[PDB]
Design a protein around this nucleic acid. Structure first.
Length: 78
DNA sequence: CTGCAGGGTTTTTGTACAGCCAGACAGTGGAGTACTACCACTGTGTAAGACAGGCCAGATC
């Protein structure tokens, strides 16, 4: 039941998946694992995501937050 | 049918080579950090009813 096992079982559960992903990256996008695996979530979730899919996906390195400028906080408070 | 027992199945759980990045450690000098205490003072308490005395007005002989 895929809830809490460690790395070295999912390893061979998805060896073929990651080999195919690397093959596709080498064929079409050069082989950048990060850019492929970050975008994999977009369409797989977006078939049926509520709205939080987009938030947690844009929660990437960009943005970012550290928090709002103190002026915006002051405006919220007053 | 039950019970246990060699081994199978596939799957885990971990140790194994071996190279290498990410963040903690020490420190510093002090800053600005961030979190606490101290200080007087607030709000929600919120209306009729019982009893004693004085007196007056209407009924009676």
């Amino acid at each position: 039941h895929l809830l809490s096992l460690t790395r070295r079982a999912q390893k061979h559960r998805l060896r073929d998946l990651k080999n195919q992903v690397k093959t596709f990256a080498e064929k079409e996008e050069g082989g950048d694992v990060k850019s492929v695996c970050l975008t994999l979530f977009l369409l797989a979730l977006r078939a049926g995501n509520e709205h939080k899919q987009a938030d947690e996906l844009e929660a990437m390195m960009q943005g970012r937050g550290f928090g709002l400028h103190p002026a915006v906080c002051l405006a919220i408070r007053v």
